[PDB]
Design a protein around this ligand. Sequence first.
Ligand SMILES: *[C@@H]1O[C@H](CO)[C@@H](O)[C@H](O)[C@H]1NC(C)=O
Lengths: 42, 48
Amino acid sequence: FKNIDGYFKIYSKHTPIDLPQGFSALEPLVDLPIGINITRFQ
Amino acid sequence: CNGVAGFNCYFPLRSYSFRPTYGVGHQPYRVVVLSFELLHAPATVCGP
Ligand SMILES: *[C@@H]1O[C@H](CO)[C@@H](O)[C@H](O)[C@H]1NC(C)=O
């Protein structure tokens, strides 16, 4: 999750298998023109 | 006026009672107003 230049960007990746080994890039999923201020999440 | 009509107590509404028999400059006009915003913004709405 990133928030830059008034855009919210979400990248995602899924895999069927403590964190595993190996390399696997994440592909872009969604961009949103929301333009708010973000400081905390849950 | 204790919530009742009377002298100096007028209901602030008035009816139109539109009829097809009025003059040309008397029938109701259907009006719309479109307002834009020319500023720096994400610019969600844009033309074809
Ligand atoms: C977001 O909030 C922080 C802390 O209140 C403030 O420093 C920052 O300027 C704000 N940014 C925007 C774009 O409102």
